[PDB]
């Protein structure tokens, strides 16, 4: 996250980290046993970390739960970047509390101009790289379809939305992938892709979660 702030202690308790001995992607807790993330974050053997203080340091208060299954969206395509969503079932249910809680799924899509909260442990620099030890947060508006499509000609699908500032300075970045975009208490987006970090006219691109609520609910019901 570039141009953001350190999140309040308990203010993002649905944020999880996907782990293979190190943090490589973010995710969102949607129920005690299920996590939403990006399809491009898939790898076998995922450990999910919840309630994290310093992601670079194992500590108490944190719960480490092995993923028991990772269900990539079946239409996910590496060339079109489309359908970049994935569901992770936790081997054991997680303990909810002040630092671990789920986030509601949307019941309708969000409109351009809505302010949302974007979070993650990704890079904080527009030039070069710096990975924070603490969760960073950014408030950003969803951009119009036209602004998104003009920034990324021929690349924006119905399953994607842009959020951030065309002026640059505030944006998601490498490491934030799979993380949450919450608008009015609803998980409306997942950090999917971008080009550069917080550059002019290159805003972050997010999976449009509202298009997948049916697939999510049907997937959870049959697993």
């Amino acid at each position: 996250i570039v141009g953001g702030y350190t999140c309040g202690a308990n203010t993002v308790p649905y944020q999880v980290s996907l782990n293979s001995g190190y943090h490589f992607c973010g995710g969102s807790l949607i129920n005690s046993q299920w996590v939403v993330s990006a399809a491009h974050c898939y790898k076998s053997g995922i450990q999910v970390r919840l309630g994290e203080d310093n992601i670079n340091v194992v500590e108490g208060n944190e719960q480490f739960i092995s993923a028991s299954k990772s269900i990539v969206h079946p239409s996910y395509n590496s060339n079109t970047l489309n359908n970049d969503i994935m569901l992770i079932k936790l081997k054991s249910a997680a303990s909810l509390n002040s630092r671990v809680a789920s986030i509601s799924l949307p019941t309708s899509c969000a409109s351009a101009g809505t302010q949302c909260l974007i979070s993650g442990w990704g890079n904080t620099k527009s030039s070069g790289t710096s990975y924070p030890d603490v969760l960073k947060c950014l408030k950003a508006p969803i951009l119009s379809d036209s602004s998104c499509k003009s920034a990324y000609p021929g690349q924006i699908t119905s399953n994607m939305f842009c959020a951030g500032y065309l002026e640059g300075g505030k944006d998601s970045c490498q490491g934030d992938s799979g993380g949450p975009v919450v608008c009015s208490g609803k998980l409306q987006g997942i950090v999917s892709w971008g080009s550069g970090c917080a550059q002019k006219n290159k805003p972050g691109v997010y999976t449009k979660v509202c298009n997948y609520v049916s697939w999510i609910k049907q997937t959870i019901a049959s697993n």
């Binding site: 490589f24 491009h40 590496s78 970047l81 970049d84 970045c173 490498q174 950090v191 892709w193 970090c197």
Partner: protein
């Protein structure tokens, strides 16, 4: 006399200097290119893309056609060589080149065991061009001009899955890359 290729700092690329080749699109667009291998083939090594935008891959050096110009320029034939840090597992080179046609996939893959220099029909498969790709970065193009009388493929290079990995091949949709000074 073509315009230079620029790294992510806006500086002109220097022949002989080490750069990471990283996807211009992060997240779902992956990370950098690296030396890899196939399940059923140890040597030569292949060109693969790291899945994670945290992983910049293996640095490369560029060699110009004319050893006298030290600037890497757009739309000019070049050799591309991975400069690994690890032990050398193979006797083949780490220079990029286009493979023979793969009947199992319909792809012309980017592989290694290429040659540096000696622009000729003998080295045709080892020459690549770098060209602007929108405002996002650059793309690789295989269209060698080093042999005016040779019939040659002339195609942008994209990324495609194979053998559980992400590889590069000739294709109609180029994948965009940026160049980062190595460490």
């Amino acid at each position: 006399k073509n315009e230079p290729v620029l790294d992510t700092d806006g500086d002109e690329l220097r022949a002989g200097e080490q750069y990471y080749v990283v996807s211009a699109i992060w997240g779902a667009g992956g990370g950098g290119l690296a030396l890899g291998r196939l399940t059923d083939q140890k040597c030569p090594e292949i060109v693969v893309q790291r899945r994670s935008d945290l992983d910049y891959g293996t640095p490369v050096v560029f060699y110009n056609l004319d050893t006298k110009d030290d600037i890497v320029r757009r739309s000019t034939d070049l050799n591309i060589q991975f400069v690994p840090i690890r032990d050398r597992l193979c006797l083949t080179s780490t220079v990029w080149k286009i493979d023979d046609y793969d009947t199992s996939t319909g792809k012309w893959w980017v592989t290694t065991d290429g040659v540096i220099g000696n622009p000729s029909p003998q080295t045709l498969q080892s020459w690549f061009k770098i060209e602007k790709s929108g405002n996002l970065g650059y793309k690789f193009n295989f269209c060698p001009s080093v042999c005016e009388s040779c019939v040659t493929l002339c195609n942008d290079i994209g990324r495609y899955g194979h053998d559980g990995q992400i590889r590069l091949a000739l294709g109609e949709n180029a994948w965009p890359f940026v160049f980062k000074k190595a460490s």
